[PDB]
Paper text:
In Gram-negative bacteria, conjugation is mediated by a large transport apparatus—the conjugative type IV secretion system (T4SS)—produced by the donor cell and embedded in both its outer and inner membranes. Here we present a single-particle cryo-EM structure of a T4SS complex from the R388 plasmid that comprises all four sub-complexes: OMCC, stalk, arches and IMC. Three ATPases, VirB4 (also known as TrwK), VirB11 (also known as TrwD) and VirD4, power the system.
The OMCC is composed of the O-layer embedded in the outer membrane and the I-layer located underneath within the periplasm. The O-layer, which comprises full-length VirB7 and the C-terminal domains of VirB10 (VirB10CTD) and VirB9 (VirB9CTD), and the I-layer, composed of the N-terminal domains of these proteins (termed VirB10NTD and VirB9NTD, respectively) form tetradecameric and hexadecameric assemblies, respectively. Thus, two heterodimeric VirB10NTD–VirB9NTD complexes insert into the I-layer (diametrically opposite), whereas the C-terminal domains of these two complexes are not inserted in the O-layer.
Numbering used by the authors:
A (entry chain C), G (entry chain F): 17 to 44
B (entry chain A): 177 to 331, 349 to 395
C (entry chain B), F (entry chain E): 136 to 266
D (entry chain D): 199 to 331, 349 to 395
E (entry chain n): 177 to 247
H (entry chain k): 177 to 198
Write the structure that this text describes.
């Protein structure tokens, strides 16, 4: 009647780009 | 005389040898005992079977002088656990065995794994197997009582079941991505793999 | 001669020419453990983290939503980049009790084939053992 | 007679340190504390252990029924300047009482819930059977002996009572300061 | 004296030997401990009898340097 | 020659040039265990305590409020400064049954990268072991 | 039904600057 | 010293020999 709790699932509301600027490792 | 046996044996002295202070050799290439290594657990941990754990350092680890990064962040630590849990226990003993630096440095630290605040062993959610331990007895008793009721309405097996399944050790579940510490149990020396050089100014 | 071969191999690994970069990455969840940059070169996916950030644990998410381990290597001058050895539509980032989802919005199922046995198209891996 | 009382810490000296790790006695483990104060010599003139020195110890064996304190042995202290001495001394409370003590979990439910539940279901079944018109001892015998667990919070004050003489003659020396 | 038996045996030191860092030889021809190999199970597994399992790697496994496909 | 190198390394460690200091720190709680000064240089955080004060225990507070251990070194002429090896928005100070919260009010997520492997930008850590 | 007590949480009312004066280690 | 019997025996290392590809 009791099961192992799952890890937190992230909310899918605040979806935004990861890259605000081009990385310099890309040489750009 | 050798009399007064009880009083004479409670008066036997306890003589503890003194200690002399020493000094650490190179504190820039050294990580001493009691240093806390903060790493993030990669594998999900279930203590049914003996197994191996893995974590990655979340932060750089400096020397005792606090001037040289001896273990880089993202270093991979490998450990293992065994033996399972006993009734009333909620934490498993994990031994971390080896750490690999991203640049190829390897050191065998055989240290105890702890929680985020240094409490001994890893702990998570505990499954005590209540039903697997008591359901046989409960079911046997209830069917016995139901049969007795039906027999009356015409107008010990439960102890045996409980004796066999009462001793089932609990199982620990720890989620992946949980923060853990490694408390360094011995002195770690990095003199053979690193050296320092001054940078030419400007 | 072998030093010459080793120098050639290192030069070929470093030159890193003819590489396309995918920067279409979104994220939702706990932004405090978020990378400052994420991209992939068609073979590996790179997440870059700031100096003051803890390095989290990164997980591979399949179509049904199940997480699984993926091998990682830590690269970069200051060990600030986690490189995972796969290109995937969705990633999961976990640190403690905080989670963040990363979405590849330009996922290419085809990718580029690995005909050489190395991470670079300029080095063969050749069978020394013979036998 | 003691040799040099400026480079000496004798038995029975109290070292006041603050507990860093949170202590839970389920598994054997290692503790850590930091000295909150400078420790002087027996003459009281030279600081032999600086404040902020790190002490490493360990405990093992768990608790027995009726016990509320765990034995902790402190093994080594490291000075911020690099001095190391192996003191193998008993850890105590803030007022010198032996062992570390905190909040005790006696596992009442894990020890008696099986028996209570078995008895109550037996009685309920008997009542239902009557309304038509030992397993409890076995359960208790197996789970009655569960040792208690001690919880001690992080940041708690503790003492180390020095069990042996500590000699600092090889690592320090004194020199007079030129006046003005 | 050899008295104080209980207290004297709880004060026996635990001295753990230190460790020295080494270095891995060739990180392009190496797969180290703790590497995760992701494979797909071929056989159906039923634990009635002891038996042998079989799986196939679903992905390439690189070296610790991450530059050579070793498996 | 090695004495010359060691002298150069010590001079580079001491010179401590091009360092920015953050002094925006607030505190709430039990002020009797409070430091007299707190600041950070972008890599380490320094809490300075008075001569008559006991040195407390300092803990790392994450976003959810969970405390965790952080390594510390004791620096200063009179061992009156605790240097923690991290820069964090919130800190917890505990001594006995008294607690004090420290808040970094100018937290920089980016920080400054550690490209050299040492606490100073003037010393490389170089791989001696080769292998 | 009984759990380990938590350490005291500091009150968030008397929030004041730590630095009344510039430290001398900053050379200021 | 040989004390700390339980903790010292849980800290005994497990050293597994490496393998070479053929």
């Amino acid at each position: 009647c009791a099961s192992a709790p799952k890890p937190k699932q992230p909310s899918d509301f605040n979806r935004e780009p990861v890259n605000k600027t081009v990385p310099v490792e890309i040489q750009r | 005389g050798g009399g007064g046996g009880e009083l004479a044996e409670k008066l036997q002295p306890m003589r503890l040898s003194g200690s002399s202070a020493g000094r650490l050799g190179n504190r820039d290439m050294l990580i001493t005992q009691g240093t806390q290594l903060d790493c993030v657990l990669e594998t999900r941990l279930v203590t049914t079977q003996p197994g191996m754990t893995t974590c990655h350092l979340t932060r750089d680890v400096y020397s005792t002088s606090g001037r040289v990064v001896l273990l880089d962040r993202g270093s991979k630590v490998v450990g293992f656990y065994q033996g399972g849990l006993r009734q009333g226990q909620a934490r498993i003993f994990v031994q971390w065995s080896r750490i690999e630096t991203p640049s190829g440095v390897v050191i065998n630290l055989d240290s105890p794994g702890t929680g985020p605040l240094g409490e001994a062993g890893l702990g998570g959610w505990i499954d005590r197997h209540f039903w697997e331990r008591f359901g046989g007895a409960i079911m046997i008793s209830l069917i016995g009582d139901l049969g007795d009721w039906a027999s009356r309405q015409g107008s010990s097996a439960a102890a045996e079941a409980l004796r066999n399944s009462i001793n089932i050790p609990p199982t620990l579940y720890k989620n992946q991505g949980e923060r853990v510490n490694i408390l360094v149990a011995r002195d770690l020396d990095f003199s053979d793999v690193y050296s320092l050089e001054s940078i030419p100014t400007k | 001669r072998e030093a010459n071969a080793r120098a050639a191999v290192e030069a070929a690994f470093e030159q890193r020419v003819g590489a396309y970069y995918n920067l279409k990455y979104m994220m939702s969840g706990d932004k405090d453990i978020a990378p400052v940059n994420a991209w992939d070169d068609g073979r590996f996916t790179y997440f870059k983290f700031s100096a003051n950030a803890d390095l989290p644990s990164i997980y591979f998410v399949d179509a049904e939503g199940n997480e699984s381990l993926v091998p990682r290597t830590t690269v970069g001058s200051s060990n600030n980049i986690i490189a995972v050895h796969k290109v995937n539509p969705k990633w999961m980032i976990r640190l403690g009790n905080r989670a963040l989802a990363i979405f590849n919005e330009a996922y290419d199922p085809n990718g580029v084939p690995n005909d050489t046995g190395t991470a670079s198209p300029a080095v063969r891996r050749v069978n020394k053992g013979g036998n």
